[PDB]
Amino acid sequence: KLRKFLLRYYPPGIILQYERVMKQKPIDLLDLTPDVDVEVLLSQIIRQEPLISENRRPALRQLIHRLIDKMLEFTLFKVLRAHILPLTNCAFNKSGDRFITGSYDRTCKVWNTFTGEEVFTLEGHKNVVYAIAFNNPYGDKIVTGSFDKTCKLWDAYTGQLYYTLKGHQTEIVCLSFNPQSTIIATGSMDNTAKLWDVETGQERATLAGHRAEIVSLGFNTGGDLIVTGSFDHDSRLWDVRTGQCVHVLSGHRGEVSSTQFNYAGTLVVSGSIDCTSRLWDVRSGRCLSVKQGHTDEVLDVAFDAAGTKMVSASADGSARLYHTLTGVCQHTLVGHEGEISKVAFNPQGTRLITASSDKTCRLWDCDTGECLQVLEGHTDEIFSCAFNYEGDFIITGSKDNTCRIWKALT
């Protein structure tokens, strides 16, 4: 029995709240353009969904109009010295009103991005805290992965330590909660990933098979599958419930640097030190596309929120921006004097930011490829840049051990 409709803007969608206890069932409108014929779309929504009856069509119509009206619509907010010893990572929560930092001082700090207050100092690790993450629709739990082979689970509101996850034989170098925040994944330099249960802390599975370090992780939107990128030149698709590898995605002639699912969960993009990015079919595990044109290592790959466009960042100082379905290269973004470590789309998929070793983060227009803004102020390389969920705030992390928060015009 349907109880509520909720609008999702990034990527477009409509969430179905029911009574049966509350799950939410999503209507994903990934290919929504402003010129959509609304009645055909409304008709197939009511047809596809047995919980949506004909009488809800007027409500459905106004929701879709708000989504269309939303497609028809940066200054320094704060500088914060996070640590004295090397800053390794930084990450927003969903809203952006909190961010976490990890360091060579074996801590993860929780920061109030409005006030600059260091809310908590998470201590107990005995080596570099290298990877950190929020359970980031919710933001109430924090996972820290360290070179002391261990991963810690914390409460973001009390600072309290829930669990210490032991089992890896070597440094932990990447991690992620799943979307439902029920399972933690840690990838290590012992060539394995491990899945852990958040409520019990007990290890749930070990994902073995890679022949070298796991540099990259990622769950799909449904928490159904997980991809791992590895120095053995492969990425692997794993089923989170069985614990088994479903596909080995080979084609990279060099170690994988980055991996990511599209929102639909039907594609993976990997970038690699062999100067290429690759597009894979999840269903069959085959390579749909090899994307060259970069002259130096590809360091980061991203889809936009909907997955209609994809971008690759390289050591050649450029970002190449493609259209996912056709594969056409729309723009090559030149301008950075250094290598490009990180790239992100805004939630609306209309602009793009890049973090570079030239101590600069640039804002680009996806339609024209013009550099809209050059974000300056860091005194060393920028290793990171990310938007909050709405795109009004950006966080850059640098090797100057400083975080800079940027805010969009009001």
Secondary structure class reads mainly beta
Strand order of the largest sheet: 4-35-34-33
Count of helix runs: 2
Head-to-tail CA distance between termini = 40 Å
Cα Rg: 21 Å
How many DSSP-defined strands? 35
Strand content: over 45%
Amount of helix = under 10%
Mind describing the biggest β-sheet? Answer: 4 strands, antiparallel
Shape: globular
Subunit structure: Interacts with IFT46 and FLA10.
Function: Functions as a cargo-specific adapter between intraflagellar transport (IFT) particles and outer row dynein. Required for efficient dynein-mediated transport into the flagellar compartment.
WD repeats: 82-121, 124-164, 167-206, 209-250, 252-290, 293-332, 335-376, 378-410
Protein name: Dynein assembly factor with WD repeat domains 1
What does this protein structure show overall?
Helix 1 crosses helix 2. The chain is globular and about 60 Å long. It contains two helices and 35 strands. The strands form nine sheets. The chain has a four-stranded antiparallel beta sheet with strand order 4-35-34-33, with no helix packed on it. Strands 5-6-7-8 form a four-stranded antiparallel beta sheet, with no helix packed on it. Strands 9-10-11-12 form a four-stranded antiparallel beta sheet, with no helix packed on it. The protein has helices at 38-48, 57-71; strands at 2-8, 13-18, 24-28, 75-81, 87-92, 98-103, 108-112, 118-122, 129-134, 141-146, 151-155, 161-165, 172-177, 183-188, 193-197, 203-207, 214-216, 225-230, 235-239, 245-249, 256-261, 267-272, 277-281, 287-291, 298-303, 309-314, 319-323, 329-333, 340-345, 351-356, 360-365, 371-376, 382-387, 393-398, 402-407. With 410 residues, it is mainly beta. The longest helix is centred in the N-terminal third of the chain and has 15 residues, at 57-71. A hairpin with a 5-residue loop joins strand 21 and strand 22.
